[PDB]
Design a protein around this ligand. Structure first.
Ligand SMILES: [Cl-]
Ligand SMILES: [Cl-]
Length: 253
């Protein structure tokens, strides 16, 4: 068995020798964020895995709420067990929103550089956002609204100028030996200005979704959940030597 989703017997093929760890966004979980992307990568031959992180006690479904330094520890644990089960030396990470920013904490302060070949962030808040911007996620996750406040650490830790973001971004954006891809959309309402999502460093590709397809108008949530154009670009980053140009035609299945 050499393709799968959360199949711990999966054995990365020679063509795709790194398992992929999928990292959800704020109010998300391991399943619902990835109902398109995971089978998309399964059918291209990847061993895919996705985790839950930042669970709040007695708050089911809506994760990414706990403190982000701890969420990075949960990521650390998960990646290790994916690598031990699979026998591979490194994983590739793909994350949406909080999920594309949070692994940077893991890379910088928890020894993640040694275990990660690539980090692909889809609309990552890499230099933070505002509470008001995170509020724009709420129409997509109604029913989470009663479990949160201005002080929910998962929310407050994402705010530019917070202790978390200050610490995350004191040094450089990048760490040696990791290939970074950032995919952003100019219709992003949650994390603005959108160029703050980009990473400055020598091994970074920063891609504007609209330069690949000017009429793909996906906003922050759609880009990480259903946007097949964005996912084609994810697939380019996971196997760069076999990449093909991502166009408007990549919506068609
Ligand atoms: Cl845990
Ligand atoms: Cl418009």
């Amino acid at each position: 068995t050499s393709r799968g989703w959360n199949d711990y017997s999966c054995k990365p093929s020679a063509a795709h020798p790194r398992p992929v760890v999928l990292v959800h966004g704020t109010f998300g979980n391991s399943i619902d964020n990835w109902l398109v992307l995971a089978p998309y990568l399964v059918n291209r031959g990847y061993c895919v895995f996705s985790l839950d992180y930042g669970q709040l006690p007695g708050v089911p479904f809506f994760h990414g709420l706990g403190p982000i330094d701890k969420s990075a520890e949960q990521l650390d644990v998960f990646v290790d067990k994916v690598l031990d089960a699979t026998g591979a030396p490194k994983a590739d990470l793909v994350g949406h929103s909080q999920g594309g920013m949070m692994p940077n904490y893991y890379l910088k302060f928890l020894g993640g550089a040694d275990k990660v070949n690539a980090l692909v962030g889809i609309a990552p808040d890499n230099h933070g956002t505002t509470l008001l911007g995170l509020t724009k996620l709420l129409p997509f996750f109604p029913g989470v609204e009663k479990f949160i406040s201005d002080n929910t650490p998962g929310l407050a830790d994402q705010v530019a100028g917070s202790p978390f973001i200050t610490k995350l971004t004191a040094g450089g954006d990048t760490v040696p030996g990791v290939r970074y891809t950032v995919i952003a959309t100019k219709y992003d309402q949650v994390v603005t200005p959108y160029r703050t999502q980009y990473l400055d460093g020598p091994n970074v590709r920063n891609v504007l979704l609209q330069d690949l397809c000017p009429v793909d108008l996906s906003e922050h949530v759609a880009i990480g959940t259903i946007d097949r154009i964005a996912f084609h670009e994810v697939a380019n980053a996971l196997d760069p030597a076999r990449a093909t140009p991502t166009t408007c035609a990549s919506v068609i299945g």
